[PDB]
Structure 1
Amino acid sequence: VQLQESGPGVVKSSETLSLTCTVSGGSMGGTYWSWLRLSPGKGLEWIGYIFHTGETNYSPSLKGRVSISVDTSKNQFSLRLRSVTAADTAVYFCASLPRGQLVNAYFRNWGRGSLVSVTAASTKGPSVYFPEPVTVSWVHTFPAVLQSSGLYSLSSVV
């Protein structure tokens, strides 16, 4: 099978997040469709899996703001997150598990991974640049820095 995910790449802070991972060339018989998150500041983490009967399971650390639904008509399953803070920026995968023992089960048939960036900033020009990374040409180019306010800053010297 092949799994493809889709969703917005920019969501505002304290806003309900949405994602949708579709399944092609297969069926949802006897599989645990799961969601996985790769963060750079906290490593790999687990979100939750869902079975085709509507029976769900979630991670205990994210319980209370996560909800995963299934729809076998359009052959896809979806994630929803609630009250997303600034620390939830990561890349999100969708994977599958075989039915049975989860003690030796390993995640297989991974997706591409849609990168989701969270923010609460606004449009502001640089004072020598949140919506657009500005380019300076006159030298060497240095990468940008994310501040705690959600802004950007760079430097360039010849």
Structure 2
Amino acid sequence: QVQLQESGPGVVKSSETLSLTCTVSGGSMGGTYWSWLRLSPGKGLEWIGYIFHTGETNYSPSLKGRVSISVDTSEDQFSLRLRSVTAADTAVYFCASLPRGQLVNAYFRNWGRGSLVSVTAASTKGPSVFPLGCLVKDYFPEPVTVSWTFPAVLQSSGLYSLSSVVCNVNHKPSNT
């Protein structure tokens, strides 16, 4: 009967602080390790850390020194804080729970929905349309609609590109 849901899917820039709050509905906060996990296409599934109701945390050694988990028992919440986020932390963040006791055979239960968090890496630019089909070179906010289509490309500079084969281009923020 215990269900978990986190905050809405936000988006952050580089060198900032990430913040997600999970809310438990039903059940108590005692005798349960409230964990945090993330899932990325580059590295697969990964564990971040858990907090017990007395405040005893246990972070992952890879992310130690830039992670912080706090518990708020009275309002039935627990939060995750990530410090100095880079462009390689674009992942779907889950929340789970573990029974108190031995962790040799323990598996994560009561998973969350999963809120996608992306990192912009400080990029904002208007469209650039080149003729060939048609090719769009650089645009940040994904507003494009090609009318007279291959999906976008995660370039290393933080900008997106697609192309279409067989025109009019659209850009909602720049009004292009």
TM-score by length of 2: 0.86
C-alpha root-mean-square deviation of aligned residues, in Å?
0.9
Which residue is equivalent to 2:79?
A: 78
Shift of 1:72: 0.7
Tell me by how many angstroms 1:123 deviates: 2.5
Instruction: Give CA deviations for 1:24-46 in whole Å, capped at 9, x if unaligned.
Output: 01111100000001010000000
Q: Distance in 1 between matches of 2:8 and 2:47?
A: 19
Q: Report runs of 4+ in structure 1 exceeding 6 Å deviation.
A: none
The Cα shift of 1:7 comes to 4.3
Contact 1:28–1:52 (CA<8 Å) still a contact in 2? yes
Deviation at residue 124 of structure 1 after TM alignment? 1.5
Given that residues 32 and 97 in structure 1 are in contact (C-alpha distance below 8 angstroms), is that contact kept between their aligned partners in structure 2? yes
**2: CA distance, partners of 1:115 / 1:146:** 16
The structure with more radius of gyration: 2
SS at match of 2:93: strand
Answer whether contact 1:7 1:18 (CA < 8 A) is retained.
Answer: no
Return the alpha-carbon distance in structure 1 between the equivalents of residues 77 and 94 of structure 2. Answer: 14
Measured in 2, the distance between the counterparts of 1:146 and 1:117 equals 12
In the other structure, the counterpart of 1:155 is: 163
- Per-residue deviation, residues 35-64 of structure 1 (Å, max 9, x unmatched): 001010000000000000000000000000
**Contact kept in structure 2, 1:121 and 1:149, CA below 8 Å:** no
Contact 2:97-2:109 at 8 Å conserved across structures: yes
Change (3 A) 1:61 1:45: same
- 2:120 aligns to what? 119
Contact kept, 8 Å, 2:34 with 2:50, in 1: the verdict is yes
Task: Determine what percentage of the aligned residue pairs are the same residue.
Answer: 99
Higher RCO by CA contacts (8 Å cutoff, separation 6 or greater): 1
Cα offset, 1:151, TM superposition: 0.3
Q: Note the residue ranges of structure 1 that are not aligned, 5 or more in a row.
A: none
Cα pair 1:93 1:110 within 8 Å, conserved: yes
Q: TM-score, normalised by structure 1?
A: 0.95
**Number of residue pairs the alignment of both structures matches:** 155
Asked whether the 8 Å contact 2:86–2:121 carries over to 1, the reply is: no
User: What residue ranges of structure 2 are gaps of 5+ in the alignment?
Assistant: 129-138, 167-176
Alignment check: 8 A CA contact 1:65 1:82 kept: yes
Show CA shifts across 1:61-102 (max 9, x none): 000000000001111000000000100110000100000010
Q: Deviations over 1:91-133 (max 9, x none)?
A: 0001000000100000000000000001223331221x21233
